[PDB]
């Protein structure tokens, strides 16, 4: 209980950094990421492989809403966590995939609730170590 | 003290020469199976198709016991390369995971070839200062 917390499946209606979502603590220096990583979020699917983010990868996330246009963010669209490249246009924000197989998500803040969970600051790829 | 960073390796100099260490990273080595011994900065996009982008720090377990299909660190005539090992017979090949790169054939009669170790994952962290 002393290192970076590891988040996997996120229930809907429950915060991401909820203790019931936390399934480990990895002893990895935070400041090795810039901004520093606050937690590791296991990535789902292949939407960001073109930048080397694969299913199973632990995305080192800085918890913040301080995210510029162009950066890769962790976002929550109607309770759903997604890791995409950001391009925010007033309250029509476009989340972009890094995989020409997927289409870019437009999310109307008039239609869905949208939260920026934090900035993507790296990945760790370790798999099963026991 | 933690895991050593290893950038480019000068020809004739060994890999883990203190001259080549560009840092120590505080990362639990037993978070990799088998455990990480050093992080090697990957150079180029030959392995992009499994997520190993150019610039990544590949976690590496120091060993020569490498099975085929495994992704390894190899030195072909003083040239460190990360590729997938195809041992199948008296035959051993270095396979990329990038359609624009051809397989590399290792003939131990033409080239000096050492298995530097096993890749047990990557750390993509970039510049932190």
């Amino acid at each position, epitope marked *: *209980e*002393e*290192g970076l917390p*590891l988040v*996997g*499946r996120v229930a809907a209606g429950e915060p991401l950094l909820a*203790q*019931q*979502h*936390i*399934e*480990g*603590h*990895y*002893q990895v220096d935070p400041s090795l990421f810039k901004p520093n990583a606050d937690f590791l979020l296991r990535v789902s699917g292949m939407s960001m492989k073109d930048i080397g983010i694969m299913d199973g990868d632990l995305l080192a996330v800085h918890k913040t809403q301080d995210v510029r246009n162009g950066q890769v963010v962790v976002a929550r669209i109607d309770d759903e966590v997604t890791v995409k490249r950001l391009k925010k246009q007033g309250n029509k924000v476009e989340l972009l995939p890094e995989n020409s197989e997927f289409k870019p998500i437009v999310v109307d803040l008039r239609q869905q609730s949208f939260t920026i969970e934090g900035l993507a600051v790296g990945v760790i790829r370790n798999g*099963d*170590w*026991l | 003290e933690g895991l050593p960073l290893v950038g480019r390796v000068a020809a004739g100099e060994p890999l883990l020469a203190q001259q080549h260490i560009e840092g120590h990273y505080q990362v*639990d*080595p*037993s*978070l990799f*199976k*088998p*455990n990480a011994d050093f992080l090697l900065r990957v150079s180029g996009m030959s392995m992009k198709d499994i997520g190993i982008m150019d610039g990544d720090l590949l976690a590496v*377990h120091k060993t020569q016991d490498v099975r085929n299909g495994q992704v390894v660190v190899a030195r072909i005539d003083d040239e460190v390369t990360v590729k997938r090992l195809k041992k199948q017979g008296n035959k051993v090949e270095l396979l990329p995971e990038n359609s624009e790169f051809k397989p590399i054939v290792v003939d131990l009669r033409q080239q000096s070839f050492t298995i530097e170790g096993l890749a047990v994952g990557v750390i993509r962290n970039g510049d932190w200062l």
Partner: nanobody
Framework: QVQLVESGGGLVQAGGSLRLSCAAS????????MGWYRQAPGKQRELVAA???????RYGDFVKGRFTISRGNAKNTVYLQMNSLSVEDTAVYYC?????????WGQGTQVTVSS
């Protein structure tokens, strides 16, 4: 070569708790990991908890905060504090160690949580 000695299983009434422990004899590298998988009759073997010699920890995705793995003041000994157990947690709980990429199993310790 490593020798793994389980203790602490048995029957528990749902909502109750029970602690498992493992001790690893033999040639133990400084760097290693230990913990528990588990196996319900019929299903496959699942990761429960794991812990490195250096303190890092991982839990299976059913644990949901409920369990806690820790290494003891003892050397090469971990305990798994299982709390809030559910009948669906009834399984055979094998202890596990790797070092250098080779695995080592325990004999198994059965845990029956009853309705």
């Amino acid at each position: 070569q490593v020798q793994l000695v389980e203790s602490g299983g048995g029957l528990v009434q749902a909502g109750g708790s029970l602690r498992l422990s493992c001790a690893a004899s033999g040639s133990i590298r400084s760097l290693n990991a230990m913990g528990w998988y588990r196996q319900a009759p019929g299903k496959q073997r699942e990761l429960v908890a794991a812990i490195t010699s250096r303190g890092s920890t991982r839990y299976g995705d059913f644990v949901k905060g409920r369990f806690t793995i820790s290494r003891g003041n003892a050397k090469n000994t971990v305990y798994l504090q299982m709390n809030s157990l559910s009948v669906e947690d009834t399984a055979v709980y094998y202890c596990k160690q790797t070092q250098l990429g080779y695995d080592y199993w325990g004999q198994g310790t059965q845990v029956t949580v009853s309705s």
